[PDB]
Short mmCIF file of C-alpha atoms and ligand atoms in Angstrom, two decimals:
data_model
loop_
_atom_site.label_atom_id
_atom_site.label_comp_id
_atom_site.label_asym_id
_atom_site.label_seq_id
_atom_site.Cartn_x
_atom_site.Cartn_y
_atom_site.Cartn_z
CA UNK A 1118 7.24 -21.81 -7.08
CA UNK A 1119 10.04 -20.52 -9.30
CA UNK A 1120 13.25 -20.62 -7.23
CA UNK A 1121 14.34 -17.11 -8.13
CA UNK A 1122 17.46 -15.74 -6.40
CA UNK A 1123 16.87 -13.58 -3.35
CA UNK A 1124 18.63 -10.82 -5.29
CA UNK A 1125 15.85 -11.04 -7.91
CA UNK A 1126 13.06 -11.74 -5.41
CA UNK A 1127 11.51 -8.32 -6.07
CA UNK A 1128 8.68 -8.06 -8.58
CA UNK A 1129 9.79 -7.59 -12.21
CA UNK A 1130 8.32 -4.07 -12.38
CA UNK A 1131 10.69 -3.10 -9.55
CA UNK A 1132 13.74 -4.58 -11.30
CA UNK A 1133 16.60 -2.16 -11.93
CA UNK A 1134 19.20 -2.26 -14.71
CA UNK A 1135 21.56 -4.51 -12.76
CA UNK A 1136 18.62 -6.72 -11.76
CA UNK A 1137 17.50 -7.52 -15.31
CA UNK A 1138 21.07 -8.57 -16.12
CA UNK A 1139 21.14 -10.83 -13.06
CA UNK A 1140 17.90 -12.44 -14.26
CA UNK A 1141 19.39 -13.10 -17.71
CA UNK A 1142 22.43 -14.85 -16.21
CA UNK A 1143 20.28 -16.77 -13.72
CA UNK A 1144 18.01 -17.84 -16.60
CA UNK A 1145 20.74 -18.92 -19.02
CA UNK A 1146 22.38 -21.04 -16.31
CA UNK A 1147 19.29 -22.41 -14.55
CA UNK A 1148 17.53 -23.48 -17.78
CA UNK A 1149 20.56 -24.10 -20.02
CA UNK A 1150 19.61 -21.35 -22.46
CA UNK A 1151 21.89 -20.10 -25.22
CA UNK A 1152 24.38 -17.49 -23.96
CA UNK A 1153 22.63 -14.12 -23.78
CA UNK A 1154 24.71 -10.95 -24.03
CA UNK A 1155 24.14 -8.37 -21.30
CA UNK A 1156 24.44 -5.64 -23.95
CA UNK A 1157 21.10 -6.97 -25.20
CA UNK A 1158 18.13 -6.27 -22.92
CA UNK A 1159 20.20 -3.48 -21.33
CA UNK A 1160 17.26 -1.80 -19.59
CA UNK A 1161 15.24 -1.78 -16.38
CA UNK A 1162 12.23 -3.88 -15.44
CA UNK A 1163 9.65 -1.43 -16.79
CA UNK A 1164 11.29 -1.62 -20.22
CA UNK A 1165 11.74 -5.40 -20.15
CA UNK A 1166 8.03 -5.74 -19.34
CA UNK A 1167 7.22 -3.64 -22.43
CA UNK A 1168 9.03 -6.03 -24.81
CA UNK A 1169 6.91 -8.28 -26.99
CA UNK A 1170 8.00 -11.85 -27.71
CA UNK A 1171 9.07 -10.51 -31.11
CA UNK A 1172 11.19 -7.87 -29.37
CA UNK A 1173 12.71 -10.50 -27.07
CA UNK A 1174 13.47 -12.67 -30.10
CA UNK A 1175 15.06 -9.62 -31.74
CA UNK A 1176 17.60 -9.22 -28.93
CA UNK A 1177 18.30 -12.97 -28.64
CA UNK A 1178 17.12 -15.11 -31.58
CA UNK A 1179 18.17 -18.34 -29.82
CA UNK A 1180 16.82 -17.60 -26.32
CA UNK A 1181 14.31 -14.75 -26.69
CA UNK A 1182 11.27 -17.03 -26.81
CA UNK A 1183 12.37 -18.88 -23.68
CA UNK A 1184 13.22 -15.65 -21.84
CA UNK A 1185 9.82 -14.18 -22.73
CA UNK A 1186 8.05 -17.31 -21.51
CA UNK A 1187 10.04 -17.24 -18.27
CA UNK A 1188 9.02 -13.62 -17.69
CA UNK A 1189 5.39 -14.64 -18.23
CA UNK A 1190 5.65 -17.49 -15.72
CA UNK A 1191 7.21 -15.15 -13.16
CA UNK A 1192 4.52 -12.51 -13.74
CA UNK A 1193 1.72 -15.08 -13.43
CA UNK A 1194 3.16 -16.32 -10.13
CA UNK A 1195 3.37 -12.77 -8.78
CA UNK A 1196 -0.26 -12.04 -9.64
CA UNK A 1197 -1.32 -15.35 -8.08
CA UNK A 1198 0.45 -14.51 -4.81
CA UNK A 1199 -1.06 -11.02 -4.69
CA UNK A 1200 -4.50 -12.58 -5.18
CA UNK A 1201 -3.79 -15.05 -2.36
CA UNK A 1202 -2.94 -12.18 0.01
CA UNK A 1203 -6.17 -10.43 -1.01
CA UNK A 1204 -8.35 -13.50 -0.39
CA UNK A 1205 -7.17 -13.83 3.22
CA UNK A 1206 -7.06 -10.10 4.12
CA UNK A 1207 -10.18 -8.37 2.83
CA UNK A 1208 -9.71 -4.73 1.88
CA UNK A 1209 -5.98 -4.83 1.15
CA UNK A 1210 -5.40 -2.97 -2.09
CA UNK A 1211 -3.40 -4.48 -4.94
CA UNK A 1212 -0.57 -2.13 -3.98
CA UNK A 1213 -0.72 -2.98 -0.27
CA UNK A 1214 -0.61 -6.69 -1.09
CA UNK A 1215 2.47 -6.37 -3.31
CA UNK A 1216 4.12 -4.17 -0.66
CA UNK A 1217 3.41 -6.80 2.00
CA UNK A 1218 4.88 -9.46 -0.30
CA UNK A 1219 7.98 -7.34 -0.84
CA UNK A 1220 8.38 -7.17 2.95
CA UNK A 1221 8.48 -10.98 3.31
CA UNK A 1222 10.62 -11.81 0.26
CA UNK A 1223 7.62 -13.04 -1.71
CA UNK A 1224 6.34 -15.43 0.96
CA UNK A 1225 2.54 -15.32 0.81
CA UNK A 1226 1.92 -17.02 4.17
CA UNK A 1227 4.24 -14.62 5.98
CA UNK A 1228 2.75 -11.60 4.20
CA UNK A 1229 -0.78 -12.58 5.23
CA UNK A 1230 0.31 -13.06 8.84
CA UNK A 1231 2.16 -9.72 8.89
CA UNK A 1232 -0.91 -7.91 7.58
CA UNK A 1233 -3.19 -9.59 10.11
CA UNK A 1234 -0.78 -8.85 12.97
CA UNK A 1235 -0.57 -5.21 11.87
CA UNK A 1236 -4.36 -4.95 12.07
CA UNK A 1237 -4.51 -6.48 15.56
CA UNK A 1238 -1.45 -4.60 16.84
CA UNK A 1239 -3.46 -1.38 16.97
CA UNK A 1240 -6.12 -3.03 19.14
CA UNK A 1241 -3.61 -4.80 21.39
CA UNK A 1242 -1.54 -1.67 22.05
CA UNK A 1243 1.07 -4.19 23.21
CA UNK A 1244 4.08 -5.93 21.66
CA UNK A 1245 4.24 -7.37 18.15
CA UNK A 1246 5.07 -10.74 19.71
CA UNK A 1247 1.91 -10.36 21.79
CA UNK A 1248 -0.20 -9.68 18.70
CA UNK A 1249 1.55 -12.51 16.85
CA UNK A 1250 1.07 -14.94 19.74
CA UNK A 1251 -2.65 -14.16 20.06
CA UNK A 1252 -3.33 -14.51 16.33
CA UNK A 1253 -1.43 -17.80 16.06
CA UNK A 1254 -3.32 -19.18 19.06
CA UNK A 1255 -6.62 -18.39 17.31
CA UNK A 1256 -5.37 -19.98 14.06
CA UNK A 1257 -5.16 -16.52 12.45
CA UNK A 1258 -8.86 -15.78 12.99
CA UNK A 1259 -8.58 -12.01 13.38
CA UNK A 1260 -12.12 -11.74 14.76
CA UNK A 1261 -11.47 -14.26 17.54
CA UNK A 1262 -8.13 -12.62 18.34
CA UNK A 1263 -9.82 -9.21 18.41
CA UNK A 1264 -12.49 -10.40 20.85
CA UNK A 1265 -9.80 -11.77 23.17
CA UNK A 1266 -7.98 -8.43 23.04
CA UNK A 1267 -11.17 -6.40 23.50
CA UNK A 1268 -11.94 -8.21 26.77
CA UNK A 1269 -8.51 -7.00 28.01
CA UNK A 1270 -8.32 -3.47 26.49
K1 LIG B 1248 7.97 -8.30 -21.87
K1 LIG B 1249 -3.25 -16.46 24.66
K1 LIG B 1250 -3.51 -6.80 29.28
#
């Protein structure tokens, strides 16, 4: 897992102007890239994600290729995590999965557990800690947890 800064934990599409610049500085220092000028790539995430490798190489001819590849690795990891959330919580939309990941700082395990607890919380009509405790006892089997709750409506 790419050790992105918590400041840049958000998905690239959600990056702001200041965020993209933070990613450039984090990238040039973490991977010893050639110094990249903030004046270049002065844009938000949506624009950065619309730059081809040629475009990248236009802004920075000595680091554009590496920066483009790093953006691809980040994007592939995001899509993998979203898929992981979807495999464990059937019915979650692509948007609900990325929202749940945003709410746990990109931690897939935590996002899955939050989504499962949110489903059970409505049945339990009790505390979040109560829903969380029940689910964890049943090893996050929502159907087993639900049956336990349903016997004690
Ligand atoms: K791009
Ligand atoms: K219990
Ligand atoms: K009860």
